[PDB]
Design a protein around this ligand. Structure first.
Ligand code: CA
Ligand code: CA
Ligand code: CA
Ligand code: CA
Length: 475
């Protein structure tokens, strides 16, 4: 019964008041359902996006179930290009969703300002989208509502990273049963969804529509109104007949055509679309990538000794929940590069190749490497870093472990971390509090023993804020 530390186990765990952790700054949006508030974490000064929902806004029993469901999706997801959920709170009359703040606004608005995207630009953007959804599709989640309106740029830099959002029409899927609900948006929605039977491939279609727009500034299917769009769509025919397309390379068209294959069975999957030459070829050579960053990350990984569960959870919390995007930009690069097959996980092969790739850049000769020795080392790294024990290194796990410990173990982070564990505010962490954070009924006497003998200096049977400090700060 291996206690799996996952980013998501931290989410619903606090049941404090909004004001116990946050200070509002301004309103980011109001809707009939609720408002999004820009808040400042009182302790860390970091800036978060808090959606605040009145119980009265959503007391449709389906609706409570619907929201709770979007929450469980988000708790599960963890990918550099997909929205990150930090916390879910409850009030006497309110629910709170603490999300990361994405300061770049909608891809839509960036569309209506420059109109057309560079082939380089568009490939990079679309690459990210498909990686998001490859991940989602792998994990049996289909979005059903892709569009520039539901993609945000993280910040304002020229080639900023992209994040997928509003999982309110998203759902779980089992390959054996096809979905039926008619959900989506005029310009982007795939024929089969109109017909009432569809699969996750609709997300590919939508992405294909998105890509058409990026390259030409126009939808491939248009209409006087929604209805006229839908008819155009359902009939299925589109064309590269616009003058704009004269400039654009044939493979890009080829990808577009493979993504807008009318019948889902013949339409390319996300995984496979990722391998399209264009996405492949738009990278003319590896962009200049810091070897030092790469070397240090690989070094910070090797030296993560396997560890007792209290520290593991602590670190995963700090990595997954307390790190600013500015903070992890370079890392998420390396991760993505490491993750050839796009699915947002590192596996033994991908990790092993990473180290080898690094070696040659160090100029080391590849036929001169004790391959069976690397493998072993890699097997052990995975054992050490795989906090949820699924045999894969996920992005949160990666960031936790790849970040400079000194940087990550900032004092604010440390304080706050202890705070989350010590639910009774007693200043002392009980095994019961540990079990609670893990999401489990009780912790094995085994595991508690194996943690105290390494942290409990007073020997009072519990872990206080300084015992905590030393444990982690013990390099
Ligand atoms: Ca992978
Ligand atoms: Ca894992
Ligand atoms: Ca306590
Ligand atoms: Ca103690």
């Amino acid at each position: 019964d291996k206690l799996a530390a996952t980013p998501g186990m931290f989410v619903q765990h606090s049941t404090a008041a909004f004001s116990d952790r946050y200070k509002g700054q301004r309103v980011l949006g109001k809707g009939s359902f609720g408002e999004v508030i820009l808040c400042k974490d009182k302790v860390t000064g970091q800036e978060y996006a808090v959606k605040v929902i009145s119980k009265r806004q959503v007391k449709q029993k389906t609706d409570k179930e619907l929201l709770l469901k979007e929450v469980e999706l988000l708790k599960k997801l963890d990918h550099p290009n997909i929205m990150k959920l930090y916390e879910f709170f409850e009030d006497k009359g309110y629910f709170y969703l603490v999300t990361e703040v994405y300061t770049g606004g909608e891809l839509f608005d960036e569309i209506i300002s420059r109109k057309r995207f560079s082939e380089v630009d568009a490939a990079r953007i679309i690459r990210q989208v498909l990686s998001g959804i490859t991940y989602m599709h792998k994990n049996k989640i289909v979005h059903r509502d892709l569009k520039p309106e539901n993609l945000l740029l993280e910040n304002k830099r020229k080639d900023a990273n992209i994040r997928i959002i509003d999982f309110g029409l998203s759902t779980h899927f089992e390959s054996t049963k096809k979905m039926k609900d008619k959900i989506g948006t005029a310009y982007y929605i795939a024929p089969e969804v109109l017909h009432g039977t569809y699969d996750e491939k609709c997300d590919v279609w939508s992405t294909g529509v998105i890509l058409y727009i990026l390259l030409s500034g126009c939808p491939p299917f248009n209409g006087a109104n929604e209805f006229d769009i839908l008819k155009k769509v359902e009939k299925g025919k589109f064309t590269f007949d616009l003058p704009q397309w004269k400039k654009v390379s044939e493979p890009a068209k080829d990808l577009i055509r493979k993504m807008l294959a009318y019948v889902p069975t013949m339409r390319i999957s996300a995984r496979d679309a990722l391998e399209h030459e264009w996405l492949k070829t738009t990278d003319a050579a590896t962009d200049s990538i810091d070897v030092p960053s790469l070397e240090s990350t690989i070094l910070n990984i090797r030296q993560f000794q396997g560890t007792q569960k209290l520290a593991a959870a602590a670190l995963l919390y700090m990595g997954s929940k307390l790190t600013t995007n500015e903070e992890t930009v370079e890392l998420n690069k390396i991760f993505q590069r490491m993750d050839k097959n796009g699915d947002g996980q590192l596996d033994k092969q991908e990790l092993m190749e990473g180290y080898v790739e690094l070696m040659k850049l160090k100029g080391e000769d590849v036929s001169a490497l004790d391959q069976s020795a690397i493998e072993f080392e890699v097997e052990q790294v995975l054992d050490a870093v795989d906090f949820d024990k699924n045999g894969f290194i996920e992005y949160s796990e990666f960031v936790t472990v790849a970040m400079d410990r000194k940087t990550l173990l900032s004092r604010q982070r440390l304080e706050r971390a202890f705070g989350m564990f010590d639910a009774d505010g007693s200043g002392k962490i009980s095994s019961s509090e540990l079990a609670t954070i893990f999401g489990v009924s009780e912790v094995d006497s085994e595991t508690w023993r194996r943690v105290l003998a390494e942290v409990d200096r007073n020997n009072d049977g519990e872990v206080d804020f300084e015992e905590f400090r030393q444990m982690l700060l013990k390099l």
